[PDB]
Amino acid sequence: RKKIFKPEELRQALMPTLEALYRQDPESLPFRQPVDPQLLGIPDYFDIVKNPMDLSTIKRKLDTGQYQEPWQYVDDVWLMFNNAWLYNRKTSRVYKFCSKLAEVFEQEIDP
Numbered sequence: 143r144k145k146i147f148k149p150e151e152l153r154q155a156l157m158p159t160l161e162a163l164y165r166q167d168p169e170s171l172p173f174r175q176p177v178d179p180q181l182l183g184i185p186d187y188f189d190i191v192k193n194p195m196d197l198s199t200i201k202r203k204l205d206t207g208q209y210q211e212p213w214q215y216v217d218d219v220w221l222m223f224n225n226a227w228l229y230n231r232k233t234s235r236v237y238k239f240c241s242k243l244a245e246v247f248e249q250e251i252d253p
């Protein structure tokens with residue numbers, strides 16, 4: 143029987159992973175707000191990255207009821223990660239920090 147789910151009904155499912163991401167020591171910091179190309183002086187960002195995503199956007203979507211299915215949220219988390227792996231060199235802090243978050247995402251899912 144078809145139904146719109148309340149944010150709380152999905153919070154139980156999604157919040158454990160989201161909290162694990164936010165908690166990471168310095169590693170979540172480049173992901174806590176949208177990438178701001180003006181501020182950061184990287185005017186090509188949106189040439190490379192067409193669908194930006196960050197943790198504040200994921201949290202807002204959760205809390206407003208925009209995730210109705212977990213696959214939507216998992217898609218979003220991986221979009222954020224793939225955007226970073228795509229734009230940033232393998233050598234960069236942002237890239238390696240992204241990798242740490244991905245590792246944390248997977249471990250939290252599968253202990």
Ligand SMILES: CC(=O)c1cc(C(=O)Nc2cc(CO)cc(-c3cnn(C4CC4)c3)c2F)c2cc(OC(=O)N(C)C)ccn12
Nearest residue numbers: 168171172173175177182183184225226229230234235236
């Ligand atoms: C996610 C992503 O792609 C991205 C994030 C940033 C970026 O600098 N985000 C950011 C935001 C905030 C808080 O507002 C903190 C940090 C940050 C990184 N390390 N730290 C610890 C010193 C305290 C904080 C951060 F990297 C960035 C910069 C970029 O520009 C750049 O690296 N240069 C050299 C121009 C390019 C991409 N990003």
